[PDB]
């Protein structure tokens, strides 16, 4: 599915960025939605710095953790929203980050596994919901909403 492939590219872009070697140049966003997701994720982490900073050097099983929560976070009432989608994806990205302050092959496979997991959850039970929102263009429009 083109919608599946577009979804997989978005998650690969963001999680790949999250997993990258510390101190290397930031890869340019591959699509508009990739740039929006990166910006939204950054704002979310700023707002909830203490919550996300706590998982930043997460030494445990990264895939297991996200796999245990992916369905409820997306599904549970009120239901799926773009806010939830960004939050779950941002959380997954946080688990993958490394760097000098944090430390104070494996990452590659984990990011691949998370791309596959999250794509499947989105294209699985919430596919209809995603299409009704206008797909990833809807996503981009949603978070570009002008502010006061």
């Amino acid at each position: 599915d083109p919608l599946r492939e577009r979804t997989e590219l978005l998650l690969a872009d963001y999680l790949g960025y999250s997993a990258r070697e510390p101190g290397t140049p930031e890869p340019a966003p591959s699509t508009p939605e990739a740039a929006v997701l990166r910006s939204a994720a950054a704002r979310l982490r700023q707002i909830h710095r203490s919550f996300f900073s706590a998982y930043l050097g997460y030494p445990g099983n990264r895939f297991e953790l996200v796999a245990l929560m992916a369905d409820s976070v997306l599904s549970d009432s009120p239901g799926p929203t773009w806010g939830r989608v960004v939050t779950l994806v941002t959380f997954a990205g946080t688990l993958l980050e490394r760097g000098p302050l944090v430390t104070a092959g494996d990452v590659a496979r984990d990011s691949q596994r998370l791309v596959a997991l999250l794509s499947s959850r989105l294209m699985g039970q919430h596919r209809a919901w995603l299409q009704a929102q206008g797909g990833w263009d809807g996503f981009s429009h949603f978070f570009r909403t002008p502010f006061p």
């Binding site: 929560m69 976070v73 929203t81 806010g83 939830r84 939050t87 959380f91 978070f143």
Partner: peptide, 24 residues
């Protein structure tokens, strides 16, 4: 089962974040 609690916070965080953009 710690996943149940973290999922809870991720859910709250996401719903709040969504509300900032919902509509405006």
């Amino acid at each position: 089962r710690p996943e149940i609690w973290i999922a809870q916070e991720l859910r709250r965080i996401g719903d709040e974040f969504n509300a900032y953009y919902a509509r405006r």
